[PDB]
Amino acid sequence: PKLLNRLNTYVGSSRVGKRFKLAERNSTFTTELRAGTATFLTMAYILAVNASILSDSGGTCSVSDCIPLCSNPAIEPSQCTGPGLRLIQPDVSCKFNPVNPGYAACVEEIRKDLIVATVAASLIGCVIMGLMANLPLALAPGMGTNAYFAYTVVGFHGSGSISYRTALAAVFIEGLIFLFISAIGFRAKLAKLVPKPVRISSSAGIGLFLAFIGLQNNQGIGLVGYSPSTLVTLAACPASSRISLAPVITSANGTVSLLAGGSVSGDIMCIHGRMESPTFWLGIVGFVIIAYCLVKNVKGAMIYGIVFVTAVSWFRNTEVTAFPNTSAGDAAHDYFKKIVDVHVIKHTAGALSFSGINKGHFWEALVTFLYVDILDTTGTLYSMARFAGFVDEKGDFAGQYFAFMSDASAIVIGSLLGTSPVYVFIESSTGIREGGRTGLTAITVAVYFLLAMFFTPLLASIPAWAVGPPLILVGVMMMKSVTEIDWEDMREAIPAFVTMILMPLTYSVAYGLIGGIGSYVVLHLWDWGEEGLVKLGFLK
């Protein structure tokens, strides 16, 4: 007949085809390849978004990486010898605005390491899922968990309460816990520990958090900036018209300023020219492109928007350039010039540290990882199984046990490589829509991720306004869970609203979950006491 059908029959009748059970699942070899291609197309925006978001965390960079700076900017530090001229030893302020050039270079190196680590963790998770579990599920570091890890647990440039190494240790312990509770088979049981309204509204809260991240300056398009009174107003004026903030002291006459050692912000307050920053408008154009491609059911909408914005930003001498005429910009362009590069992780791999176990914030972060990973994993696996028709009358899909162990092992490996916990994604459904039924789809996605290596220079040149609109639209897609919340019932509307609004407003998934669980418990205390008295018999 045709060469394509000959290939399909040869693969299906071979040992590898029988091992993957292609015949018993009615999926051919090329069907699995097409499903993997579609899954990678709908998933590959991670290679930009997750790597950049983890890059904001600062990685393993510390104050030791900041170089001493001369008294005046006009003299290079080696020539900083003269009257009234001295070199300033770095402090904790070296990490934040104005960022020490040494710390910035360390952050770029960490960005390359984290691109490679994210790709490697996704590859290893996909391979484990395809081989050990034999399911068309593609694994990659999660969106909300990654954002929580970077901006809340470790914070921007390590401003959080837990260091990056200790957060990696938390992720590793979380993976070990999942391995333990999935070897027994209790993950389905712990999928009911959390309250229902919290369970549904956590996704919408995480989506709002991601959209708010995408509406900021350091990794979004702008449009949300500091306000002295209202605390948040319309940003997206040009970067030349943005100024920093430092804490001050007020008195009954005038504002005698400068609390010494105060943490100066970035460039968040807009002085004039609102709605005029070209980077924000380029982000809006990419947003429109992604939105149209999502409306038209075009696979890779996120990819097309990111690529368009990044390619416009790759030009050297524009206002939207990703390589400004600076030493750091010149280095970024020099690294981007070599299109293909094989990068070896040097700082992030094996960067675990169990020193901060005793701290309360460590356990808060670990419990948050447990809760969020449980919700995402149990929801997505059963949604996928319903998509693929693997759900029987009992409600299981045969390989669920190995699927959960694969996810836990992939989380452990990602922690060892130095990334946020890795999930099966909802976009895996795309492959299932394309006919993907066996683990060969995961193998194909892993091969695509492998080819996504040797392209670190193209992935490290993706600007913030390119990361940008993908976050907003990911939040839009996550928002759809609000439909099955009974907003008429206050016992369910109040905890759900509280969770959903605290995640973006406290800027913390942990704080949103804690607030929602506390509100649920408080609002149901009366009912639980009534039921306890009824069981005891004081009431009828």
Next chain:
Amino acid sequence: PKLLNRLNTYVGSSRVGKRFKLAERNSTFTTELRAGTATFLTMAYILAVNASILSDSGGTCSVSDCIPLCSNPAIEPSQCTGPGLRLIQPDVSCKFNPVNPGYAACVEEIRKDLIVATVAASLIGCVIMGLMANLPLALAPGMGTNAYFAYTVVGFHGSGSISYRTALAAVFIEGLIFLFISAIGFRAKLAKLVPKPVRISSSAGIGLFLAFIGLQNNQGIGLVGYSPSTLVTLAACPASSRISLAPVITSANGTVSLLAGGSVSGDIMCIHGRMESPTFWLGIVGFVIIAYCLVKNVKGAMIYGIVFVTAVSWFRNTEVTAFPNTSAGDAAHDYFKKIVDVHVIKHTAGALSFSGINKGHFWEALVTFLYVDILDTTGTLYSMARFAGFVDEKGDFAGQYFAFMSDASAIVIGSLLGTSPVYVFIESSTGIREGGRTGLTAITVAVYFLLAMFFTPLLASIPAWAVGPPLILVGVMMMKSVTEIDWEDMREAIPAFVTMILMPLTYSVAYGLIGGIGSYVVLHLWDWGEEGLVKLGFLK
């Protein structure tokens, strides 16, 4: 029979009963009184929330009422005569932190005016609806437009782009516009001008906006404070541990500070003691009290939470006191000590000013008032008519012509008295449930508002953490509109999400609507262009 039944039969056969059509609507006199009481109880939280929010707008006064301050705080301004000692002329910074004692005298005096103006607008609006339209609809300044008028159009202490007097002129003209388009009868027709996702998600966006205000410091319980990096984190540390911010200049060596004339913020940045401010915990207790009463279907849930928090804050020497041991706090207690007082509006009444018509921000606010009021009034009235069974097969409720013209007339009067536009509340549905059918219910609510006067001292003593949880819980109830947004459709999910999220993030209803309408128009340009070519005939 009974004296109660004798009263019902006497009025029903009287001229007043026949004019109100009690017999033809099967509602008795006491039924309207119970309905009016239930409507007032369900909506009485405006007497706390409304006046407080408009008070933050700064009212009518300006830097002219800030008093000159001595060089040092330790010397009273009259005794400010000595070597190196001088009186500081007030500037625009007198209005903001640290607030000039002269300007702080306004807000207390303006708050008393805005308590009466809120009641008088509510009283007159209820009477006109009760008499001219004969419907059980209670009119009061809207919750969402209140916050937009105070915090966005005029801004906190007049920091916005439009002065309070000009914003009143916007409301007056905006009131005239409906009076014109309701006399013709087109207000039903303009209910379709807005896109469907924008109309539905505007309520949820406003609810997020209102809950966002309830989580701030100047009008809420706290728990949301400034962050140097993330721009929002967990506030609600004690007020002694909050510090201000002033814009600064960064260089390549160090942050040489103080952009001269920069707008110093309030007390938004928390240094330590997070989750330890007693005022926030008092608000949470009030939040729990309202939530349980809302759950238990207890009428007046908002008031009980407001009253309990306000009553605890009335004690003089606690950490949650509403009258701190200051000169302003002593004056607040002195005015509170006289329980009953008849207040005459002296600054706010008739404070219109058409000087700023030519400015663009004036028309942005006026059109935003026009849009917001169209969605609120048309949606509420038909929901009320469905509740009261006044909707015929044609979909009208007979007295709709005067119902819209009554609402327009009340808005004009409210602007003259100096409040935000007044609407029929959704809480008007409450009295309809107990049997409110004629305009006598509105008269009864009007009488209660009359009794709400002579209690300005008790209403001007309501602290920010008492306003607080009602705003959060009003945001919860407004959030129920999300259920009829097709979140599967990106042509509706994206504009709805954008509309919903910009209102609390840009912290502006106008920006949320402009973004949502712009996103709706852009995302439908391809479809409209396709159908335009189909009508022309280039396509099939």
